[PDB]
């Protein structure tokens, strides 16, 4: 349809949909860690952090750090056995609390993953992952949230994005998924950084000793031209990203303006056969890059197939205003 047509049933779409009780939410997860260590820093990282906003059905994602892993905000996050292992041991205890805390929550350690997490459900609000000694996870946020502060309404793209990905179950968050929000967060902002409706922000300027453990709320007002200009950015990203962006060659990166390749990554078929993150193959199909982490692919579990089944729904969005007629 029309970009008028397309933007007036996305804002039709999102009348139920700030950051009103995460901060009760942080409290109690804090006395959990304060338990197991009270030095330990807690942060909140995510959507939450990412728009300046809560969203339904969005969980609340936190992460645990030492005072010197924050005071070193300017190193990564390493990828080792051991580094995975006691991540491991800190998200074990805490669990281990949690549930002597909260009778009816159910407290899971998941492993399969790159990234220890423990999944925490209570039931209504009670939605939140928690993992460990990882700043790569909240520097990323506050890029993200960097970009979202320069052109708040652009979050309202990012938004139906996010919302459709998880319709059509192409987000990671989601049973079957392969892509989590994250990575198509980094599609939209490089897609408007593409179109310069983002201005470009080095990486290297997030420091995160000087992020806020649970940053401010950012205003998010409904859009006043009847959602003419989202209709506009949603058909203007899908076609970016069916005719414009090239997956054979190019590479979603936000660590240089413009345009990164493949072969200077070396991401590469190649490379897909001397890999195996948890056991399997990485695929260099549909590539993301992960600014803060070394060599990482958040489009790794992109098989050829989920790259032609996001192709698929990429069309189909376009015709049916991202699933909402
Ligand atoms: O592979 C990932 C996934 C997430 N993050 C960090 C950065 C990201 O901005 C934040 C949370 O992203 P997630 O994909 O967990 O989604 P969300 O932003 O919390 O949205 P929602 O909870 O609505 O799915 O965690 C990473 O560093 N790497
Ligand atoms: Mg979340
Ligand atoms: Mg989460």
């Not at 009760?24 to 728009?51: E, I, K, Q």
């Not at 030492?66 to 390493?78: I, L, P, Q, R, Y």
């Not at 928690?130 to 309404?153: D, H, K």
């Not at 995160?208 to 203007?236: F, I, K, N, Y």
Request: hydrophobic share 40%; proline share 5%.
């Amino acid at each position: 349809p029309s970009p008028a047509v397309v933007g007036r049933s996305l804002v039709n779409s999102f009348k139920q949909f700030h950051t009103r009780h995460v901060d009760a939410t942080y409290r109690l997860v804090l006395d959990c860690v304060a338990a197991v260590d009270p030095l330990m820093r807690l942060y909140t990282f995510g959507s939450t952090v990412v728009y300046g906003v809560h969203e339904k059905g969005s969980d609340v994602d936190f992460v645990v750090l030492n005072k010197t892993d924050v005071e070193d905000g300017k190193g990564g996050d390493a990828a080792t056995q051991v580094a995975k292992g006691l991540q491991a041991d800190i998200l074990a205890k805490l669990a281990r609390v949690i549930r002597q805390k909260h009778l009816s929550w159910n407290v899971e350690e998941v492993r399969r993953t790159r990234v220890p997490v423990v999944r925490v459900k209570g039931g209504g609000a009670v939605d939140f992952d928690i993992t460990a000694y990882r700043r790569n996870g909240v520097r990323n946020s506050a890029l993200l949230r960097a970009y979202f502060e320069q052109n708040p309404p652009c979050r309202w793209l990012s938004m139906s994005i996010k919302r459709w990905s998880k319709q059509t179950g192409l987000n990671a968050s989601v049973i079957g998924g392969s892509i989590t929000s994250y990575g198509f967060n980094l599609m939209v902002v490089y897609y408007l950084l593409q179109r310069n409706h983002l201005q470009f922000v080095p990486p290297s300027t997030i420091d995160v000793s000087r992020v806020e453990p649970l940053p401010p709320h950012l205003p998010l007002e409904e859009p006043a031209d009847e959602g003419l200009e989202l209709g506009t950015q949603v058909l203007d990203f899908l076609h970016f990203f069916l005719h414009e962006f090239d997956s054979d060659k190019q590479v979603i990166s936000l660590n240089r303006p413009g345009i990164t390749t493949k072969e200077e990554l070396d991401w590469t078929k190649s490379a897909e056969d001397f890999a195996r993150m948890n056991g399997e193959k990485v695929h260099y199909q549909w590539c993301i890059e992960d600014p803060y982490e070394l060599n990482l692919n958040v489009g790794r579990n992109v098989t050829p197939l989920k790259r032609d089944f996001l192709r698929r729904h990429l069309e189909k969005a376009r015709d049916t205003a991202l699933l909402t007629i």
